[PDB]
Amino acid sequence: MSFRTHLESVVNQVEGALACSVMGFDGISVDTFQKDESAELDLNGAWVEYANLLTQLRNAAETLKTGTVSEVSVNSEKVLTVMRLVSPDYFLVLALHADGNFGKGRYVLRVTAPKVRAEL
Amino acid sequence: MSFRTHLESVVNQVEGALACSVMGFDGISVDTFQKDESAELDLNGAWVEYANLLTQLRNAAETLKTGTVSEVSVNSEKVLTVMRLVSPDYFLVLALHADGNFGKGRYVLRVTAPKVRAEL
Ligand code: NA
Ligand code: NA
């Protein structure tokens, strides 16, 4: 959890950001920072779909290990995700509300991923 | 290829659009419309990465079959993709150049997917 300052930066910078996490390909979460301060909206619908996305995220994130693939997104009606490779064992996941800033999420995760890779 | 008029609409509407296709989960492509009119840019780098993305696309697109997942993106440095479910056997793939309009691609594919589902 040297990671956690970086995970917090992403969530603070991205409107509609629910959570930023480091996840293993073994399917075990390593670290997270979740938005606490409730947004104008009701996130509870988004949390339900976020929980329901977790199996699918880990499956799609496997494609990050190939040389060509640098970014994967697995999205529902209420939740958008962006994922990037950290190491052969770990990837970074940003979840945001469907009304959040997806373009800014993609940009902020791309800037942050090198800093997370440096904490290993 | 009742599909092809819909595939063409997507490519015409989206700046940086390389191709819009219908793909089976059996891994066999059904129909496509590719941009012919070369864009200001040199697409050849993008075509190389597009060809290299095809195995990974079909793998991530499997997650579209679950109820929660409505949209998947598998992206490289030069190519962005958006995918949506058409039927249990088929999905729709939009590929665009990294400098294209990703937000407009996502919007246009979401509008078009119902029309493609209607052609089955
Ligand atoms: Na990769
Ligand atoms: Na689905």
Q: Domain containing B31 — which CATH number?
A: 3.30.450.30
Q: Name every residue whose Cβ is closer than 8 Å to that of residue A24 and which is 6 or more positions away in sequence.
A: A30, A89, A90
Decide if B11 contacts B19 (C-beta within 8 A): yes
Decide if B110 contacts B81 (C-beta within 8 A): no
Answer whether B71 sits within 8 Å of A75, measured CB to CB. Answer: yes
Decide if B18 contacts B96 (C-beta within 8 A): yes
Question: In this structure, which long-range contacts are made by residues B25-28, counting pairs with CB atoms below 8 Å and at least 24 apart in sequence?
Answer: B25/B58, B25/B61, B25/B62, B25/B65, B25/B88, B25/B89, B25/B90, B25/B91, B26/B89, B27/B58
Chain B interface disruption, residue of A25, A47, A59, A75, most B CBs within 10 A: A75
SS (H, E, C) chain B: CCCHHHHHHHHHHCCCEEEEEEEECCCCEEEEEECCCCCCCCCHHHHHHHHHHHHHHHHHHHHHHCCCCCEEEEECCCEEEEEEECCCCEEEEEEEECCCCHHHHHHHHHHHHHHHHHCC
Residue identified by tokens 């999905």 is B91
Answer whether A74 sits within 8 Å of B63, measured CB to CB. Answer: yes
For chain B, the domain total comes to 1
Resolution of the determined structure in angstroms stands at 2.2
Q: Is B48 on the interface with A (CB under 8 A)?
A: no
C-alpha span between B120 and B117 (Å, rounded)? 6
Helix, strand, or coil (residue A47): helix
Distances (CA, A) of B95 to A32, A36, B54: 32, 36, 11
In this structure, chain A runs to a length of 120
Q: Quote the domain boundaries for residue B90.
A: 3-118
Distances (CA, A) of A88 to A4, A58, A72: 20, 13, 15
C-alpha span between B100 and B98 (Å, rounded)? 6
Q: Is A62 on the interface with B (CB under 8 A)?
A: yes
Bridge partners of residue B32, in order along the sequence: B21
Distances (CA, A) of A49 to A3, A17, A73, A79, B86: 25, 14, 14, 7, 21
Decide if A103 contacts A80 (C-beta within 8 A): no
C-alpha span between A86 and B100 (Å, rounded)? 26
Helix, strand, or coil (residue A23): strand
Q: Name every residue whose Cβ is closer than 8 Å to that of residue A96 and which is 6 or more positions away in sequence.
A: A14, A15, A16, A17, A18, A79, A80, A81, A102, A105
The one-letter amino acid code at B91 reads: F
B87 phi and psi angles, rounded to 5 deg: -165, 175
Neighbours of A36 (CB within 10 A): 6
Residue identified by tokens 């902020």 is A108
| Helices A102-118, B102-118: inter-axial angle, 10-degree rounding | 120
Bridge partners of residue A94, in order along the sequence: A20, A82
Pairing of strands A17-24, A90-97: antiparallel
Distances (CA, A) of B96 to A46, A48, A71, B13, B49: 28, 31, 14, 12, 11
